[PDB]
Protein backbone atom coordinates (compact mmCIF):
# COMPACT_ATOMS: atom_id res chain seq x y z
CA UNK A 1 0.00 0.00 0.00
CA UNK A 2 0.97 3.64 -0.62
CA UNK A 3 1.32 5.61 2.62
CA UNK A 4 2.99 9.00 2.69
CA UNK A 5 5.39 9.96 5.47
CA UNK A 6 4.26 12.42 8.16
CA UNK A 7 6.45 15.08 6.53
CA UNK A 8 4.84 14.49 3.13
CA UNK A 9 1.33 14.60 4.58
CA UNK A 10 1.97 17.93 6.23
CA UNK A 11 3.72 19.50 3.25
CA UNK A 12 1.45 18.15 0.49
CA UNK A 13 -1.51 19.38 2.53
CA UNK A 14 -0.05 22.89 2.82
CA UNK A 15 1.02 23.16 -0.83
CA UNK A 16 -2.18 21.58 -2.09
CA UNK A 17 -5.71 21.83 -0.73
CA UNK A 18 -8.46 19.78 0.90
CA UNK A 19 -11.44 18.29 -0.88
CA UNK A 20 -14.57 16.68 0.56
CA UNK A 21 -16.35 14.03 -1.42
CA UNK A 22 -19.56 12.24 -0.53
CA UNK A 23 -20.24 8.53 -0.34
CA UNK A 24 -20.97 7.29 -3.86
CA UNK A 25 -19.54 10.32 -5.65
CA UNK A 26 -17.11 9.99 -8.53
CA UNK A 27 -13.79 11.84 -8.32
CA UNK A 28 -12.79 11.03 -11.88
CA UNK A 29 -13.52 8.47 -14.61
CA UNK A 30 -11.16 5.95 -16.11
CA UNK A 31 -9.65 7.15 -19.38
CA UNK A 32 -10.05 10.81 -18.47
CA UNK A 33 -7.48 13.59 -18.65
CA UNK A 34 -6.23 14.64 -15.21
CA UNK A 35 -3.20 16.50 -13.91
CA UNK A 36 -3.71 16.48 -10.14
CA UNK A 37 -2.90 13.75 -7.65
CA UNK A 38 -4.69 12.92 -4.37
CA UNK A 39 -4.00 11.68 -0.85
CA UNK A 40 -6.75 10.04 1.19
CA UNK A 41 -6.86 11.45 4.72
CA UNK A 42 -10.29 10.21 5.78
CA UNK A 43 -12.63 7.58 4.41
CA UNK A 44 -11.88 5.40 1.44
CA UNK A 45 -11.36 5.73 -2.30
CA UNK A 46 -12.03 2.85 -4.66
CA UNK A 47 -10.09 2.47 -7.87
CA UNK A 48 -11.87 0.74 -10.77
CA UNK A 49 -9.47 -0.46 -13.48
CA UNK A 50 -12.24 -1.73 -15.69
CA UNK A 51 -12.72 -5.13 -17.25
CA UNK A 52 -12.93 -7.87 -14.61
CA UNK A 53 -10.15 -6.67 -12.35
CA UNK A 54 -10.24 -6.48 -8.56
CA UNK A 55 -11.11 -3.11 -7.05
CA UNK A 56 -8.41 -1.37 -5.03
CA UNK A 57 -9.39 0.21 -1.73
CA UNK A 58 -7.38 3.18 -0.57
CA UNK A 59 -7.56 4.27 3.06
CA UNK A 60 -6.08 7.26 4.96
CA UNK A 61 -2.48 8.08 4.04
CA UNK A 62 -2.62 6.38 0.65
CA UNK A 63 -2.02 8.35 -2.55
CA UNK A 64 -3.05 8.01 -6.19
CA UNK A 65 -3.22 9.96 -9.41
CA UNK A 66 0.50 10.77 -9.39
CA UNK A 67 0.67 9.42 -12.97
CA UNK A 68 -1.85 12.03 -14.08
CA UNK A 69 0.20 14.60 -12.23
CA UNK A 70 3.61 13.61 -13.59
CA UNK A 71 2.89 12.61 -17.19
CA UNK A 72 1.29 15.09 -19.57
CA UNK A 73 -1.77 13.85 -21.46
CA UNK A 74 -1.90 10.70 -19.33
CA UNK A 75 -5.33 9.09 -19.36
CA UNK A 76 -6.60 7.97 -15.95
CA UNK A 77 -5.79 4.27 -15.57
CA UNK A 78 -8.76 3.81 -13.26
CA UNK A 79 -11.99 5.41 -12.24
CA UNK A 80 -11.92 6.87 -8.73
CA UNK A 81 -14.93 7.10 -6.44
CA UNK A 82 -15.77 7.50 -2.76
CA UNK A 83 -17.00 4.46 -0.89
CA UNK A 84 -17.95 6.54 2.14
CA UNK A 85 -17.74 10.26 2.95
CA UNK A 86 -14.08 11.01 2.37
CA UNK A 87 -11.60 13.82 2.58
CA UNK A 88 -8.57 14.25 0.39
CA UNK A 89 -5.48 16.30 -0.12
CA UNK A 90 -5.69 17.50 -3.72
CA UNK A 91 -2.32 18.46 -5.23
CA UNK A 92 -2.26 20.22 -8.61
CA UNK A 93 0.45 20.49 -11.24
CA UNK A 94 1.53 23.97 -10.10
CA UNK A 95 1.45 23.01 -6.43
CA UNK A 96 3.79 20.13 -7.16
CA UNK A 97 6.16 22.38 -9.10
CA UNK A 98 6.24 24.71 -6.09
CA UNK A 99 6.99 21.80 -3.76
CA UNK A 100 9.84 20.60 -5.98
CA UNK A 101 11.24 24.15 -5.88
CA UNK A 102 10.97 24.55 -2.12
CA UNK A 103 11.90 21.00 -1.15
CA UNK A 104 13.52 18.94 -3.90
CA UNK A 105 14.92 16.40 -1.45
CA UNK A 106 11.54 15.43 -0.05
CA UNK A 107 10.06 15.25 -3.56
CA UNK A 108 12.91 13.01 -4.79
CA UNK A 109 12.25 10.59 -1.94
CA UNK A 110 8.55 10.60 -2.80
CA UNK A 111 9.20 10.07 -6.55
CA UNK A 112 11.47 7.19 -5.67
CA UNK A 113 8.83 5.43 -3.59
CA UNK A 114 6.35 6.13 -6.41
CA UNK A 115 8.51 4.25 -8.88
CA UNK A 116 8.70 1.26 -6.54
CA UNK A 117 4.90 1.29 -6.21
CA UNK A 118 4.24 1.72 -9.95
CA UNK A 119 6.43 -1.24 -10.92
CA UNK A 120 4.24 -3.48 -8.75
CA UNK A 121 1.15 -2.61 -9.92
CA UNK A 122 -1.24 -2.71 -12.91
CA UNK A 123 -3.91 -5.38 -12.44
CA UNK B 1 10.24 11.27 -28.44
CA UNK B 2 10.43 8.08 -26.37
CA UNK B 3 14.20 7.59 -26.29
CA UNK B 4 16.00 8.18 -22.98
CA UNK B 5 18.60 10.99 -23.24
CA UNK B 6 20.11 12.55 -20.16
CA UNK B 7 20.61 16.33 -20.00
CA UNK B 8 24.16 17.76 -20.27
CA UNK B 9 24.13 18.40 -16.52
CA UNK B 10 23.07 14.81 -15.79
CA UNK B 11 25.73 13.40 -18.12
CA UNK B 12 28.48 15.36 -16.39
CA UNK B 13 27.28 14.75 -12.82
CA UNK B 14 26.35 11.08 -13.25
CA UNK B 15 29.76 10.60 -14.88
CA UNK B 16 31.53 12.17 -11.89
CA UNK B 17 29.58 10.39 -9.12
CA UNK B 18 29.76 7.09 -11.00
CA UNK B 19 32.50 5.50 -13.07
CA UNK B 20 33.30 4.49 -16.63
CA UNK B 21 33.06 1.01 -18.06
CA UNK B 22 34.29 -0.33 -21.38
CA UNK B 23 32.51 -3.22 -22.95
CA UNK B 24 33.54 -5.13 -26.05
CA UNK B 25 31.34 -5.90 -29.05
CA UNK B 26 29.29 -9.02 -28.35
CA UNK B 27 29.78 -8.93 -24.58
CA UNK B 28 26.90 -9.23 -22.15
CA UNK B 29 26.55 -6.55 -19.47
CA UNK B 30 23.83 -8.47 -17.66
CA UNK B 31 21.26 -11.23 -18.17
CA UNK B 32 17.50 -10.90 -18.04
CA UNK B 33 16.15 -11.97 -14.66
CA UNK B 34 19.34 -11.24 -12.75
CA UNK B 35 19.80 -9.17 -9.61
CA UNK B 36 21.19 -5.74 -10.42
CA UNK B 37 21.51 -2.56 -8.40
CA UNK B 38 23.30 -0.24 -10.81
CA UNK B 39 22.04 1.74 -13.77
CA UNK B 40 23.94 2.66 -16.91
CA UNK B 41 24.30 5.49 -19.40
CA UNK B 42 25.58 4.82 -22.93
CA UNK B 43 28.21 7.38 -23.99
CA UNK B 44 29.70 5.55 -26.97
CA UNK B 45 28.49 2.67 -29.10
CA UNK B 46 25.20 0.86 -28.57
CA UNK B 47 23.55 -1.39 -26.03
CA UNK B 48 20.87 -3.88 -27.07
CA UNK B 49 18.06 -4.78 -24.70
CA UNK B 50 16.54 -8.26 -25.10
CA UNK B 51 13.18 -8.59 -23.37
CA UNK B 52 12.70 -12.25 -24.21
CA UNK B 53 9.67 -13.86 -25.83
CA UNK B 54 9.31 -12.61 -29.40
CA UNK B 55 9.62 -8.93 -28.61
CA UNK B 56 11.54 -6.40 -30.67
CA UNK B 57 15.04 -5.58 -29.47
CA UNK B 58 15.66 -2.07 -28.16
CA UNK B 59 18.80 -0.26 -29.28
CA UNK B 60 20.28 2.35 -26.99
CA UNK B 61 22.86 4.80 -28.33
CA UNK B 62 24.96 7.59 -26.73
CA UNK B 63 23.19 9.55 -24.00
CA UNK B 64 20.51 6.91 -23.41
CA UNK B 65 20.10 5.34 -19.97
CA UNK B 66 18.82 2.02 -18.67
CA UNK B 67 18.82 -0.11 -15.56
CA UNK B 68 17.32 2.57 -13.30
CA UNK B 69 14.69 0.03 -12.17
CA UNK B 70 17.44 -2.23 -10.85
CA UNK B 71 18.93 0.81 -9.17
CA UNK B 72 15.73 2.12 -7.55
CA UNK B 73 13.77 -1.02 -6.65
CA UNK B 74 15.26 -3.48 -4.19
CA UNK B 75 15.34 -7.12 -5.34
CA UNK B 76 14.23 -6.08 -8.83
CA UNK B 77 14.98 -8.68 -11.47
CA UNK B 78 16.40 -7.27 -14.72
CA UNK B 79 13.54 -6.89 -17.20
CA UNK B 80 15.89 -7.44 -20.12
CA UNK B 81 19.27 -8.82 -21.01
CA UNK B 82 21.80 -6.12 -21.92
CA UNK B 83 24.66 -6.64 -24.37
CA UNK B 84 27.05 -4.59 -26.48
CA UNK B 85 26.30 -4.49 -30.20
CA UNK B 86 29.63 -2.83 -30.92
CA UNK B 87 32.50 -1.73 -28.68
CA UNK B 88 30.78 0.56 -26.21
CA UNK B 89 31.51 2.83 -23.28
CA UNK B 90 29.12 3.39 -20.40
CA UNK B 91 28.67 5.45 -17.29
CA UNK B 92 28.06 2.98 -14.48
CA UNK B 93 26.18 4.41 -11.49
CA UNK B 94 26.02 2.28 -8.33
CA UNK B 95 23.43 2.34 -5.55
CA UNK B 96 25.74 4.24 -3.17
CA UNK B 97 26.74 6.65 -5.95
CA UNK B 98 23.09 7.48 -6.55
CA UNK B 99 22.50 8.06 -2.84
CA UNK B 100 25.48 10.44 -2.85
CA UNK B 101 23.99 12.23 -5.86
CA UNK B 102 20.60 12.68 -4.21
CA UNK B 103 22.26 14.16 -1.14
CA UNK B 104 24.40 16.59 -3.11
CA UNK B 105 21.85 17.57 -5.75
CA UNK B 106 18.29 16.52 -4.90
CA UNK B 107 16.81 18.91 -7.44
CA UNK B 108 18.72 17.41 -10.37
CA UNK B 109 17.76 13.91 -9.23
CA UNK B 110 14.06 14.79 -8.83
CA UNK B 111 13.98 16.07 -12.39
CA UNK B 112 15.68 12.89 -13.55
CA UNK B 113 13.30 10.67 -11.55
CA UNK B 114 10.36 12.53 -13.01
CA UNK B 115 11.64 11.93 -16.54
CA UNK B 116 12.17 8.26 -15.61
CA UNK B 117 8.53 7.78 -14.56
CA UNK B 118 7.30 9.16 -17.89
CA UNK B 119 9.63 6.82 -19.79
CA UNK B 120 8.66 3.79 -17.69
CA UNK B 121 4.90 4.35 -17.88
CA UNK B 122 5.49 4.50 -21.63
CA UNK B 123 7.47 1.23 -21.61
CA UNK B 124 7.11 -2.56 -21.36
CA UNK B 125 7.54 -4.36 -24.69
N1 LIG C 1 -2.21 1.66 -13.87
C1 LIG C 1 -2.30 1.41 -12.56
N2 LIG C 1 -2.59 2.44 -11.72
C2 LIG C 1 -2.69 2.25 -10.39
C3 LIG C 1 -2.49 0.92 -9.83
N3 LIG C 1 -2.64 1.01 -8.53
C4 LIG C 1 -2.91 2.29 -8.25
N4 LIG C 1 -2.94 3.03 -9.35
C5 LIG C 1 -3.21 4.48 -9.37
O1 LIG C 1 -4.51 4.66 -9.91
C6 LIG C 1 -4.45 5.93 -10.50
C7 LIG C 1 -5.61 6.47 -11.32
O2 LIG C 1 -5.19 7.74 -11.81
P1 LIG C 1 -3.84 7.82 -12.71
O3 LIG C 1 -4.05 7.17 -14.06
O4 LIG C 1 -3.65 9.30 -12.60
O5 LIG C 1 -2.80 7.24 -11.68
C8 LIG C 1 -3.13 5.93 -11.22
C9 LIG C 1 -2.24 5.31 -10.20
O6 LIG C 1 -1.56 6.32 -9.43
C10 LIG C 1 -2.18 -0.16 -10.77
O7 LIG C 1 -2.00 -1.32 -10.34
N5 LIG C 1 -2.10 0.15 -12.10
N1 LIG D 1 10.27 -3.00 -18.25
C1 LIG D 1 10.82 -2.33 -19.29
N2 LIG D 1 12.13 -1.88 -19.17
C2 LIG D 1 12.73 -1.19 -20.19
C3 LIG D 1 11.97 -0.93 -21.43
N3 LIG D 1 12.77 -0.26 -22.24
C4 LIG D 1 13.94 -0.08 -21.61
N4 LIG D 1 13.94 -0.63 -20.39
C5 LIG D 1 15.09 -0.60 -19.44
O1 LIG D 1 15.40 -1.98 -19.51
C6 LIG D 1 16.07 -2.24 -18.30
C7 LIG D 1 16.44 -3.64 -17.89
O2 LIG D 1 17.05 -3.45 -16.61
P1 LIG D 1 16.27 -2.97 -15.68
O3 LIG D 1 14.99 -3.71 -15.51
O4 LIG D 1 17.37 -2.66 -14.71
O5 LIG D 1 15.94 -1.59 -15.99
C8 LIG D 1 15.24 -1.56 -17.26
C9 LIG D 1 15.01 -0.24 -17.94
O6 LIG D 1 15.95 0.80 -17.67
C10 LIG D 1 10.58 -1.45 -21.48
O7 LIG D 1 9.90 -1.26 -22.49
N5 LIG D 1 10.08 -2.11 -20.40
Numbering used by the authors:
A (entry chain B): 25 to 147
B (entry chain A): 23 to 147
Which text from the study accompanies this structure?
One candidate cyclic GMP effector is XC_0249, a protein with a predicted cyclic mononucleotide-binding (cNMP) domain attached to a GGDEF domain that is active in synthesis of cyclic di-GMP. The findings showed that cyclic GMP addition led to an increase in the activity of XC_0249 in cyclic di-GMP synthesis. Mutation of either XC_0250 or XC_0249 led to a reduced virulence to plants and reduced biofilm formation in vitro. These findings describe a regulatory pathway in which cyclic GMP regulates virulence and biofilm formation through interaction with a novel effector that directly links cyclic GMP and cyclic di-GMP signalling.
The Fo-Fc electron density map of the complex showed a clear electron density for cyclic GMP adopting a syn configuration when bound to the protein, that is with the ribose H1’ and guanine H8 bonds oriented in the same direction. Cyclic GMP makes a number of contacts with the residues surrounding the ligand-binding pocket. A number of these residues form specific H bonds with the ribose 2′-OH, phosphate lactone oxygen atoms and, importantly, with the guanine base. Residue E146 is especially interesting, as it is located within the opposing αC helix, with its two carboxylate oxygen atoms forming two crucial H bonds with the guanine N1 and N2 atoms. N145 is also a critical residue, as its side chain amide nitrogen atom forms one H bond with the guanine O6 atom. The XC_0249 cyclic NMP domain dimer exhibits an interface area of 1344 Å2, and each cyclic GMP exhibits an interface area of ∼300 Å2, giving a ΔG of −2.9 kcal mol−1 as calculated using the PISA program. The major difference between the two structures is the diad motif of N145 and E146, which form strong H bonds with the guanine base of cyclic GMP and which contribute to cyclic GMP binding.
